[PDB]
Amino acid sequence: MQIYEGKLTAEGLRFGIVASRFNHALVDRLVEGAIDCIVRHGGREEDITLVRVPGSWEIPVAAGELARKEDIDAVIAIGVLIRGATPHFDYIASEVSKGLANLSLELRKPITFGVITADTLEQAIERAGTKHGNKGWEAALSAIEMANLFKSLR
Amino acid sequence: MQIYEGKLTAEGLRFGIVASRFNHALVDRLVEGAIDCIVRHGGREEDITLVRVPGSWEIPVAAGELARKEDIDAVIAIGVLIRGATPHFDYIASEVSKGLANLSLELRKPITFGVITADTLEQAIERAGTKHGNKGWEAALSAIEMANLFKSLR
Amino acid sequence: MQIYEGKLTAEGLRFGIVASRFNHALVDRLVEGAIDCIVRHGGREEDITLVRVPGSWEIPVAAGELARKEDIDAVIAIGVLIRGATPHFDYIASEVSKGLANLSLELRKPITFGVITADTLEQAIERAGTKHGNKGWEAALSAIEMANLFKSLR
Amino acid sequence: MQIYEGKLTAEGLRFGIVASRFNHALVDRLVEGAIDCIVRHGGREEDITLVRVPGSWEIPVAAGELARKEDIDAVIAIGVLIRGATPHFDYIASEVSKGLANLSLELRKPITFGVITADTLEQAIERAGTKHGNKGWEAALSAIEMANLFKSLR
Amino acid sequence: MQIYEGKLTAEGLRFGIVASRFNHALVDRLVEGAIDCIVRHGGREEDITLVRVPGSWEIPVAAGELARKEDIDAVIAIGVLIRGATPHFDYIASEVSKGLANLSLELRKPITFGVITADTLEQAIERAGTKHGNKGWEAALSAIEMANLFKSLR
Amino acid sequence: MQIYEGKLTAEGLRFGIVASRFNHALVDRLVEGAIDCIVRHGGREEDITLVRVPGSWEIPVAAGELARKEDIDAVIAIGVLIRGATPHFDYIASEVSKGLANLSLELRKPITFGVITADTLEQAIERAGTKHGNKGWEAALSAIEMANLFKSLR
Amino acid sequence: MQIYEGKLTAEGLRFGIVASRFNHALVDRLVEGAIDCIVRHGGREEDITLVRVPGSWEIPVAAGELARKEDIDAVIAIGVLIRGATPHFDYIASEVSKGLANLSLELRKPITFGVITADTLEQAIERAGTKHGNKGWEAALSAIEMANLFKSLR
């Protein structure tokens, strides 16, 4: 059987992170986790490109520009959506996730999903560096693995 | 009437399996089922290519690379999604299923769906080699049928 | 370790199917599934012998005649029992299952069990080609596996 | 595909009927139905052998003697069990059905089941020539079919 | 039509009775009824062989020895089972009835069933010489009929 | 007093294991336990013969072939039955246990019972390597003891 | 990978058992199990040293003396604590378990835990040779494994 997989050492890997500013008190924890994951897995901080955008709605268009760079191996999408009173949350969550997934396939490059889509503020806190981990750290780890995988797969 | 169908003998067929690591204790049973189905239907294990990715989110982009290979007749997607407290599950389940379906049409190649999308852990267990079967085995059997069908249809 | 197993290709295998007429609108779907399973697994339809009997009660005695044939590799028992108002169902279900199992051991030949024993009509429909599969297809697949296994085991 | 089945014309067929006397007011209707079914399907009444026994318990041992006769093509078992206050009914119903089924397999000869096993008197009446038919007639029709089937199968 | 039946005169008939000692205050009434039935139907008491055993569990093995005697025309099994707190009753009732039925078929000799299987003590009393008759008397009458029947049938 | 018993050291003992594939995610743990029990009790893995069958229904006929081998000292039956919506479970559980027990007596060779018969999935998990142990390990230990016992007893 | 494990044959192994007298009617069953486990796994009974003490409280200080013996390979602690009306149970259960564990580490020698700590008498009975096994047998089996493991590990 042929088996392809990615290791978790990030030596030489270059990452794009797109992080939204809405709910920054939480997003900022996700960005810390992502960078920490990259660096302590051996990636250089100098090899990270961070792009900030207003909200989750704007993440895809910026990710699309990063993912098109030949010297970016994977993109990590980071944001925090918390449900308000209207279905505003639903349309933005739907389109951010669809855009990111579509770009990854179109550009044949890993784009990982560190966007929280929480019904409540408490759930968002849980996932931004507390009891349910740090989704930035998780999405970065996935990007490490995928970039390594893609060295042989792509 | 012209009738086209695929038999279930897998002699000479070559398969790509993309399997996620999230919920591996269940995904690993799905992979065992898929391989077993292929091998005991006459497919050679050497003609199987297994690609591992972090989570169901990452299955599509890897499947896209496999399905593009001229020496892969069909791709089998294997993963396990279990609903958490937030709609995180919904956005990932939606995008994994849409990506896989879109890729299949774009590449004109069968990509089968052995991704469990369960509301509960119990339901996932049921479908990963217990009372409700093994979705890996099922998706592999579908891929056998489709690859054979495609020998005359494509 | 010595390991014996049966593959699922049916080339050269010869099957007996005994199917009851009671509840034929469901039994007939089970017979379709059994024949389809055999044929698309590489067995020839000519190599199938189908014996029809009135009810599940009469399946064992017919199966006994088929299983004694040297050119029958396995027998597939197909019928549909649905509970009525009295324990009639219990005595027939008990005896059909015991007879088939006893014959298999006495004749040292696989006899598989595609007899539905349902409490309700809905449950029978579920198992005769709808949401819970086709018990004829399942019993045929088992018979394929057992006949192959028996080529080395018997 | 080889197909074996029994037609429903009874010309030249010879039947054994074993009928118990317990609950005779209902068993007697079952015997009328069985004979009528045979005769109007073309069987001669002279070719019917009727054996009377006390209760359903005694049906098997008498059926064993009839089924051993070379000039009997099939045996029809007729009796009526209605649940009393104790499990007496369960042990008799279990043993009558098991004995009959066992004899059929041991002697390789059809023995059909026109024994009512009712929880209530009403249910027994329903099945002895009223709204739910006549189980004697039914069991006779099955024996006609099986004897014909056995002309080629046995 | 050929018709076989047994009359109820017991002249010249020889019977075996196997009676258990558990619940003897009731079993003893069953033995009185059995002997009375035989004698007043014309059988000689000298032609009766009574075998006593500890409990219903031991009835079959003793009945097996009696029924094998060429000078015994039928065996009458007599015992009293009353449900206790555990399923002990179920396993013994099941096996006594199965053994007796099996022996009758194996030895091609009538063995009648005068074993009470009662849920309550009251039910046992009812059936041991009170309002619901005497099961010993009943089983003896059946044995008379069967022995006579067997003079022509066996 | 003469006392016969089996020790638990398995040096030189040869075992047959028959394992069903239905509910393999659990059966596979039972097989691990059985093999582990044999090997760490001093049995050689080379002296184990493993036979795979589709379902619990098919275990008896395969076990019958293994148990007939003069170089097999005991057979371990391993399977997992979990109750569905219908009495299907009952008829299979009944016949698997009956067949195995009957074969053991007919062949005068130990056949041990490592078949789980659970009302719920949770109960099956409990007994397949979690809180209520591993029934494969247990049945193997029993087979070790019985094979040793049989060295003097048989 | 280097892998260390203990087999379950006890040839040549020498055990210390410390058993308390409080609740002896249960403890005595635990001691029976422990000795039986050892002996039937190949250990000699002569190689067992049994030390009796008044209550679970006193088990540690005795185990400390046994575990210091160079010719003792492992110590098995056996006792039965059942909750009374006061927290007396808690303080003794806490100190017995702590002492044993501490001794094991200090002396670098396996000391296994066959002390029942039951809320009820029923629970104690269950674990002292009835439905939930025999904790003496379990703790002995552990000690056999650990002593063997320690032959390479220590």
Ligand SMILES: O=Nc1c(NC[C@H](O)[C@H](O)[C@H](O)CO)[nH]c(=O)[nH]c1=O
């Ligand atoms: O509204 N709540 C959220 C949000 N709204 C802003 C939106 O993404 C966009 O910036 C504006 O619609 C303008 O285009 N953006 C988030 O990241 N999280 C939220 O929870």
Ligand SMILES: O=Nc1c(NC[C@H](O)[C@H](O)[C@H](O)CO)[nH]c(=O)[nH]c1=O
């Ligand atoms: O969250 N639950 C699940 C999960 N999340 C991980 C996700 O697929 C992706 O790896 C990350 O978002 C990073 O891109 N992936 C699954 O396969 N199943 C789940 O049940």
Ligand SMILES: O=Nc1c(NC[C@H](O)[C@H](O)[C@H](O)CO)[nH]c(=O)[nH]c1=O
């Ligand atoms: O009654 N219901 C059922 C039925 N009774 C007919 C029976 O098997 C037999 O043919 C007669 O007793 C005559 O011997 N047979 C079935 O297969 N399914 C049923 O649900």
Ligand SMILES: O=Nc1c(NC[C@H](O)[C@H](O)[C@H](O)CO)[nH]c(=O)[nH]c1=O
């Ligand atoms: O009891 N109820 C029934 C009955 N008991 C008699 C029994 O079959 C046997 O004749 C005696 O036990 C003596 O051997 N026999 C029936 O056919 N139907 C019944 O409903």
Ligand SMILES: O=Nc1c(NC[C@H](O)[C@H](O)[C@H](O)CO)[nH]c(=O)[nH]c1=O
């Ligand atoms: O237990 N209750 C009953 C009983 N138990 C004894 C049993 O038959 C046997 O003798 C012993 O198990 C020893 O083999 N025997 C009966 O006839 N009736 C009962 O109601």
Ligand SMILES: O=Nc1c(NC[C@H](O)[C@H](O)[C@H](O)CO)[nH]c(=O)[nH]c1=O
């Ligand atoms: O249905 N549930 C179960 C199952 N049915 C399959 C059956 O044993 C047999 O393979 C078929 O009837 C074909 O003969 N087999 C099991 O081992 N466990 C189950 O829980």
Ligand SMILES: O=Nc1c(NC[C@H](O)[C@H](O)[C@H](O)CO)[nH]c(=O)[nH]c1=O
């Ligand atoms: O009290 N109940 C228990 C008990 N008390 C005695 C105690 O261990 C000690 O011997 C005295 O305190 C004197 O030192 N010892 C037990 O083993 N089990 C009990 O359930």
